[PDB]
Amino acid sequence: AGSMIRTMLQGKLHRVKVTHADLHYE
Amino acid sequence: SMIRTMLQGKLHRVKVTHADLHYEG
Amino acid sequence: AGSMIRTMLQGKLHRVKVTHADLHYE
Amino acid sequence: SMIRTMLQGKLHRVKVTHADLHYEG
Amino acid sequence: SCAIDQDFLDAAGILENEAIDIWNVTNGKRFSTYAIAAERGSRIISVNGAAAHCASVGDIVIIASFVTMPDEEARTWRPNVAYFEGDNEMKRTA
Amino acid sequence: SCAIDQDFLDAAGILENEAIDIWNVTNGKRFSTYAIAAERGSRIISVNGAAAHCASVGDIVIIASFVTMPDEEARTWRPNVAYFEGDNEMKRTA
Amino acid sequence: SCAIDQDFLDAAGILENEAIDIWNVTNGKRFSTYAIAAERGSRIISVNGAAAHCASVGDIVIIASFVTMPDEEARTWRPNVAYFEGDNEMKRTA
Amino acid sequence: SCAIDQDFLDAAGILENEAIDIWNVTNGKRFSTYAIAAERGSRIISVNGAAAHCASVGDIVIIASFVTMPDEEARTWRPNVAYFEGDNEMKRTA
């Protein structure tokens, strides 16, 4: 009841490489 | 007790019709 | 229980003028 | 039911001692 | 703010006074504001006050809102997406 | 951090130490900080620390706070808006 | 939006339609979007729409999701981390 | 990330893996990352990976974390503030 709520790192992909970029994605 | 932030909704590729710098509202 | 939670404008100061700027505030 | 976002804490005017672009952690 | 045709707000489940993210496909700018209702059927997307610095008339944008909920519900959550082309013509899915 | 006349905080329902967004109408800069109370009746808007890089004396700004609430409460929610002119003279309406 | 191999989403505990932060190690750009599931085993990281202005094919990025929880749970919380090398080859440790 | 002397984390109530905002007083840059513990007594502030693009050794920064709570509690909430000068020497208040 009225607990103070933290924002915490849930998870991460560390140093993944971008494979595709699509400006016109629908 | 783990709360997620999720996409509620989106308007995909709408065009800006008007720009009002001096808006009062 | 498991209610979907919105982020809503609580309030705003509309077109107030900055009166002071202090880079070195302590 | 109105939930506020509040400053929890701050480190005021600390100096950066190190910069590591290639950090693996 | 950003004023949006109430028909578009209805389709995307976005509320008047709700926090929204605007991602500008034309100029790459990304900013956060809140939604205002424009007249139903007007097909208006109006960038008001400071936001006028981040978008120009004719810019193509994506407008998104986010909600929080427990992990158990988040696993099956389904966003409300409206698709547009031409002069803010909403594609048949609503 | 941003020091704000306590009368202005009262009118907008903004609390001391609350997260705030500042949208600079003059230069288009957008940043997030927290509210500090200035003396009641001072009409102070003071941009302190790193935020002094984003606003200057005379700049016109919007200062907004956001709260979270369930969808039903959100659908009838009325934000607390204070309108300003001249010497940071506050009014209830535009 | 960012399409991510479902195997990668599984390893990091990231859900489809979850808000994500992308931190571009190559060009220093930082932006917030949401996760889309790509085919399991595709090893896809696709930056779609306006986000294509912030990242290019070959850029090294960190993709992070954040959750909220009470302080006591936060103090013993262990984030789900996946480490990558080469052809988006995933490992449990650095 | 940002690695921070555990003594500093203790004083400010900032947790390992907590979301933090970094506001750069030197160059005006503002970004969001998460906190890592550095060795107790080291007085280290290390900007790691993509964040290295936003701060240089010697830059003066403010590091902040934010929490949510109901309005009733927020009205009396008291942030944890640590003050520094010279080579990350914490001023007597802890």
Numbering used by the authors:
A (entry chain AAA), C (entry chain AAA): -2 to 23
B (entry chain DDD), D (entry chain DDD): 0 to 24
E (entry chain EaE), F (entry chain BBB), G (entry chain BBB), H (entry chain EaE): 25 to 118
From the paper:
We have determined the structure of ADC in the presence of the d-serined-serine ligand using X-ray diffraction. As in the apo-ADC structure, the liganded ADC tetramer is formed by a crystallographic two-fold, with two ADC monomers in the asymmetric units. As in the apo structure, a fraction of mis-processed ADC is present, where the backbone of the zymogen is cleaved, but the β subunit has an N-terminal serine instead of a pyruvate. This mis-processed form is present at ≈40% occupancy. The d-serine molecule adopts two conformations in both subunits of the asymmetric unit. One conformer (60% occupancy) forms hydrogen bonds with the main chain of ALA-75, the side-chains of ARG-54 and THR-57, and the pyruvoyl carbonyl (ESI†) adopting a similar binding conformation to the native substrate l-aspartate. The second conformer (40% occupancy) forms hydrogen bonds with the side-chains of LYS-9 and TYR-58 (ESI†) and with the nitrogen atom of the mis-processed β N-terminal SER-25. The degree of “openness” is not the same in the two ADC subunits of the asymmetric unit. There is a significant change in the conformation of the α C-terminal loop of chain A (subunit 1) which shows a displacement of 4.3 Å of the Cα of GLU-23 from its position in the apo structure and a clear change in the conformation of its side-chain (bottom). However, for chain D (subunit 2), the structural change is relatively small with a Cα–Cα distance of only 0.8 Å for the same residue, although d-serine is bound in both subunits (top).
